[PDB]
């Protein structure tokens, strides 16, 4: 059974069995993550929603890796005006593995 949840301002789609990527936790591997900020549970058919991020039912997960991303480069440039500059960024993350969704 498929479901949608909130991790931060990043919004997250998931099924049962799925590995998903989210915003940095202080949490490390070997711990359990859970989101009760689940907005609905649906399969082919989206339910009726009275309160925002319904408190009924859970998404159980566990951390499987906390690390830091590899280095992408961002180029800042403007023609004719002779402007050229360069930046890097990596960003941290936490990967979670969904161990089950309620019914």
């Amino acid at each position: 059974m498929y479901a949608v949840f909130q991790s931060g301002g990043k919004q997250h789609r998931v099924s049962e069995g799925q590995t998903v990527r989210l915003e940095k936790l202080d949490i490390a591997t070997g711990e359990t993550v859970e989101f009760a900020e689940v907005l609905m549970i649906a399969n082919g058919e989206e339910v009726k929603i009275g309160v925002p991020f319904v408190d009924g039912g859970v998404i159980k997960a566990e951390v499987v890796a906390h690390g830091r991303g590899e280095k992408v480069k961002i180029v800042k440039f403007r023609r004719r005006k002779h402007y050229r500059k360069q930046q890097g960024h990596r960003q941290w993350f936490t990967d979670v593995k969904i161990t089950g969704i309620s019914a």
């Binding site: 990043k10 997250h12 789609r13 998931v14 799925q18 998903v20 990527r21 989210l22």
Partner: protein, 142 residues
């Protein structure tokens, strides 16, 4: 952030025969184009359109409304000779009845590449030279 992502796999067409029932030229027309994109239904594809396989077969089930009997844009010409040549709304029905509906969906086609990617899914095969009854597709009235 990470999850399922849009693809050329998530695509649905199937075969439709559009037998309209006296619908006015443009309320047929804009629906034929719309479905030839798939905007009558879900896309989820930032790339080539999902479309449907559309046969037009009705040909002559068109009517008019307004003074667009003669004023309508179908004007065309060539560098070969000078002037303008023309065709009327009544001309376009009176010979090859397909033609009015065909160049109603023509002008809705996007850019260069995508408007061609749509075109290869549409079929008329000339006014009154039809053979698509041999398939018997999913019927459609409008």
């Amino acid at each position: 952030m990470k999850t399922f992502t849009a693809k050329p796999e998530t695509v649905k067409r199937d075969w439709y025969v559009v037998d309209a029932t006296g619908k006015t030229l443009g309320r047929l027309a804009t629906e034929l184009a719309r479905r030839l994109r798939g905007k009558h239904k879900a896309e989820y594809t930032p790339h080539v359109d999902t479309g449907d396989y559309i046969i037009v077969l009705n040909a002559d089930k068109v009517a008019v409304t307004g003074n667009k009997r003669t004023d309508k844009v179908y004007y065309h010409h060539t560098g070969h000779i000078g002037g303008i040549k023309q065709a009327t709304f009544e001309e376009m029905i009176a010979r090859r009845p397909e033609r009015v509906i065909e160049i109603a969906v023509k002008g809705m086609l996007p850019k260069g590449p995508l408007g061609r990617a749509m075109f290869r899914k549409l079929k008329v095969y000339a006014g009154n030279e039809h053979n698509h009854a041999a398939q018997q597709p999913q019927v459609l009235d409008i």
